[PDB]
Amino acid sequence: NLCPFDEVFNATTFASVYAWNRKRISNCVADYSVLYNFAPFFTFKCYGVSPTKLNDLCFTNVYADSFVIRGNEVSQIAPGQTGNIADYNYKLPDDFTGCVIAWNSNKLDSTVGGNYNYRYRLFRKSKLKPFERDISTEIYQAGNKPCNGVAGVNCYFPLQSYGFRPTYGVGHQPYRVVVLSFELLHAPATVC
Amino acid sequence: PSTIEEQAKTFLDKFNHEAEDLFYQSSLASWNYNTNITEENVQNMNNAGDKWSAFLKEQSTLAQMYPLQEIQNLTVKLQLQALQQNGSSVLSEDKSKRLNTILNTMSTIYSTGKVCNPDNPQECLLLEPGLNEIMANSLDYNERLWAWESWRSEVGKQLRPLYEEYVVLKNEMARANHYEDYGDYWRGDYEVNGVDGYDYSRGQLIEDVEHTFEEIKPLYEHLHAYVRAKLMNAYPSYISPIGCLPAHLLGDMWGRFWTNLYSLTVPFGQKPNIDVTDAMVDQAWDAQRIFKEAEKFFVSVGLPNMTQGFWENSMLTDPGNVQKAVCHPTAWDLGKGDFRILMCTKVTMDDFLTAHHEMGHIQYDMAYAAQPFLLRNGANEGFHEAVGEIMSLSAATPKHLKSIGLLSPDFQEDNETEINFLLKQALTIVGTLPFTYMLEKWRWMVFKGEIPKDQWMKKWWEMKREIVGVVEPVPHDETYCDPASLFHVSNDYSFIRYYTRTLYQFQFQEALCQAAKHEGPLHKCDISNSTEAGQKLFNMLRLGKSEPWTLALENVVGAKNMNVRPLLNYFEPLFTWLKDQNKNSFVGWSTDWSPY
């Protein structure tokens, strides 16, 4: 009879996409009103599970991911999209039955002169897979030439910095995102 | 594997991402300088700009390493060539420093040139504003003669040798970059290649401009005869009824715009012009309401509304006594979703029209934002200002002013004030077309080397007489350089943009009014509440510069080539009225005349 719904949704240290944070929470069963009192928060897609269907009978385990992203790319934190944050930074499965929650952090994550701490990967010699994480900081070989493990032609640092400044337009402003995966495989409603 | 095209796409991706950040840095620095003139912001602007310049030079080298010969995606190839432009760096470093020294030197001679009246060697007057108001508000032929000759003597004589060497070095620069002269470099803006059905040689610009000017000549002849008549009244013994109009009498120091002469050439003086300024001040109208009405216009045609960044980050009034800021109305696209307008708005009709014009700039910027960074611009050098002018013209129509409430519900037009309106409009619009053509042609032939130097200050006036219809009030030897006395000639700005923009804006407006189902004379059409003209204009605005200028021209006006016919179709009523009022006047002029 205990739940955390303040630790991940109320934290001033959100993680970037290349290191999408994931915290797990079991034996919980918290209600919906705890997560239905935070202003408009853009629009929260809840695939499979219907939003207002929490109650008690539900899933077992849960893996909650959190990161940041410009609002142009929130549509990419969704099944099927092929945008830069998806096929190169963070891919959601096609059978995804979790949920997505997004809001603006221009009030806090963006800083004057640039909060370049928040970043994202743009070059990767391969596509990503569901719930996969890559933290490699290794020069990207792009054209046929044995990259000397160093920066140069066809050899770029795989991570670009967002670097937010509050005056940016809504599209380039810092949205904060949290996805709520779900699984009820051979277990007694771990959460529920 | 890894074909060159894929590698170039990767490079351009890295560029389009880091550039955007640096361009935002420099744009925001420039904005904080122009909204608050403090030395600190000045320094930050210079720093950000020089860093952006170094970034672009380095990336230009790295992009020139890519080969345009083996790239089969034009949307990529255009960005590549645009960044590949090596520029004046091809000149010898010594020659590059000399050229840049000459550019800044002539620009500072212009911006620091003054004429000291012999009345008092202590007292002097600069171009801005002393000489300008002397030449734009006085009627005394002697004083205006003095000012014309004085600014062309103290300043132009200096700018002569520098501009000579300038021709030399710019020719070398363009010959290196594989252009037949610096004029070919300037004409290469309308160059379209590799797209069948839309390509445009760099000399087809010359042919189309000359042929279109041939079609413009008659309206300018009748306007010249009428203006010559009214001025012949003004000055009782100073212009030949068959002679070229004198120079220091045209309205400005160079004669590029005849708009001032309106006060002496109004067809019906008793008929006042339409100015709602008092009506605005008397309806609680604030600059907020001005820009809201602009938003409302662009919304009524279908285009989006200004982002909250504009309604929150833009200076739409004079700040105050404490702050000091630039007030020349400017449209700013800092990128990354940030669009602003800098304007020290006053409750006048001029600022109402200018607000619509600059917000049209802003809407054009918002449309071409989805494109890659290098491809975020106007289709050519005259597309932007043309868009702004079509906004101003749709606004000024008495129909629109009625709709917004700044006009009475039953204000009935009179043909005399439509003649006055069309005549003022033609004094500005039509009057500057021969000037622009003549001056740009002089520069073009000089860069080709057809005009020998010892025959410079000669040929100019010949063209001035044979094309513009203006006589020099004083004989000038080659120790002068009156060309260089213009701001654009000594500050190295291609000129033909204004001629083009004019023809463009009229073609645009006529096509849009067609979509908007307006009937009657073209100067009475308002695109308001018309969604279809908005969609058409947006189909042009979204492309930015990803497709050729001919294609966007077809996307709006429905044709691939420039055509004066919309412009003449706009000014035709005035044309008839001129022909009438000039029945008893000689139409045309004669080279021979000259008050000497």
Swiss-Prot record, chain A:
Positions of disulphide bridges: C3-C28, C46-C99, C58-C192, C147-C155
Effect of F157S: In strain: Lambda/C.37, Omicron/BQ.1.1, Omicron/XBB.1.5, Omicron/EG.5.1
Region of interest (Disordered), residue spans: 122-157
Record-annotated BetaCoV S1-CTD domain positions: 1-192
Residues covered by region (Integrin-binding motif): 70-72
Outcome, altering Q160Y: Reduced host ACE2-binding affinity in vitro
Sugar-modified residues: N10
Region feature (Receptor-binding domain (RBD)): 1-192
Effect on the protein upon substituting T43A: In strain: Omicron/BA.2, Omicron/BA.2.12.1, Omicron/BA.4, Omicron/BA.5, Omicron/BQ.1.1, Omicron/XBB.1.5, Omicron/EG.5.1
Outcome following mutation: Q160N: Reduced host ACE2-binding affinity in vitro
Region: Receptor-binding motif, residue numbers: 104-175
Region of interest called Immunodominant HLA epitope recognized by the CD8+, as start-end residue ranges on this chain: 115-123
Functional note: Attaches the virion to the cell membrane by interacting with host receptor, initiating the infection. The major receptor is host ACE2. When S2/S2' has been cleaved, binding to the receptor triggers direct fusion at the cell membrane. When S2/S2' has not been cleaved, binding to the receptor results in internalization of the virus by endocytosis using host TFRC and GRM2 and leading to fusion of the virion membrane with the host endosomal membrane. Alternatively, may use NRP1/NRP2 and integrin as entry receptors.
Quaternary organization: Binds to host ACE2. RBD also interacts with the N-linked glycan on 'Asn-90' of ACE2. Cleavage of S generates a polybasic C-terminal sequence on S1 that binds to host Neuropilin-1 (NRP1) and Neuropilin-2 (NRP2) receptors. Interacts with host integrin alpha-5/beta-1 (ITGA5:ITGB1) and with ACE2 in complex with integrin alpha-5/beta-1 (ITGA5:ITGB1). May interact via cytoplasmic c-terminus with M protein. May interact (via N-terminus) with host bilirubin and biliverdin, thereby preventing antibody binding to the SARS-CoV-2 spike NTD via an allosteric mechanism.
Protein name (Swiss-Prot/TrEMBL): Spike protein S1
Native organism: Severe acute respiratory syndrome coronavirus 2 (2019-nCoV)
Lineage: Viruses, Riboviria, Orthornavirae, Pisuviricota, Pisoniviricetes
Part of the whole protein covered: 334 to 525 of 1273
Curated annotation (Swiss-Prot), chain B:
Recorded GO MF terms: carboxypeptidase activity; endopeptidase activity; identical protein binding; metallocarboxypeptidase activity; metallopeptidase activity; peptidyl-dipeptidase activity; transporter activator activity; virus receptor activity
Mutagenesis or variant effect for R376A: Slightly inhibits interaction with SARS-CoV spike glycoprotein
Positions of the Peptidase M2 domain: 2-590
Effect of F23D: Increases slightly the interaction with RBD domain of SARS-CoV-2 spike protein
Native organism taxonomy: Eukaryota, Metazoa, Chordata, Craniata, Vertebrata
Outcome after substituting K292D: No effect on interaction with SARS-CoV spike glycoprotein
Effect of R542S: Slightly inhibits interaction with SARS-CoV spike glycoprotein
Residues of the full protein shown: 19 to 613 of 805
Function field: Essential counter-regulatory carboxypeptidase of the renin-angiotensin hormone system that is a critical regulator of blood volume, systemic vascular resistance, and thus cardiovascular homeostasis. Converts angiotensin I to angiotensin 1-9, a nine-amino acid peptide with anti-hypertrophic effects in cardiomyocytes, and angiotensin II to angiotensin 1-7, which then acts as a beneficial vasodilator and anti-proliferation agent, counterbalancing the actions of the vasoconstrictor angiotensin II. (Microbial infection) Acts as a receptor for human coronaviruses SARS-CoV and SARS-CoV-2, as well as human coronavirus NL63/HCoV-NL63.
Outcome of substituting A369L: Increases slightly the interaction with RBD domain of SARS-CoV-2 spike protein. In sACE2.v2.2; increases interaction with RBD domain of SARS-CoV-2 spike protein
Protein name: Angiotensin-converting enzyme 2
Active site: E358 (proton acceptor), H488 (proton donor)
Annotated GO biological process: angiotensin maturation; angiotensin-mediated drinking behavior; blood vessel diameter maintenance; entry receptor-mediated virion attachment to host cell; maternal process involved in female pregnancy; membrane fusion; negative regulation of ERK1 and ERK2 cascade; negative regulation of smooth muscle cell proliferation
Principal location: membrane
Annotated cofactor note: Binds 1 zinc ion per subunit.
Consequence when changing H17A: Increases slightly the interaction with RBD domain of SARS-CoV-2 spike protein
The keyword Lipid biosynthesis is assigned to this record: no
Outcome of substituting W254Q: About 95% loss of angiotensin I cleavage
Effect of mutating Q59T: Increases slightly the interaction with RBD domain of SARS-CoV-2 spike protein
Entry similarity comment: Belongs to the peptidase M2 family.
Superkingdom classification of source: Eukaryota
Effect of F586T: No effect on interaction with SARS-CoV spike glycoprotein
Effect of R152Q: About 95% loss of angiotensin I cleavage
Assembly information from the UniProt record: Homodimer. Interacts with the catalytically active form of TMPRSS2. Interacts with SLC6A19; this interaction is essential for expression and function of SLC6A19 in intestine. Interacts with ITGA5:ITGB1. Interacts (via PDZ-binding motif) with NHERF1 (via PDZ domains); the interaction may enhance ACE2 membrane residence.
Mutation effect (E93P): No effect on interaction with SARS-CoV spike glycoprotein
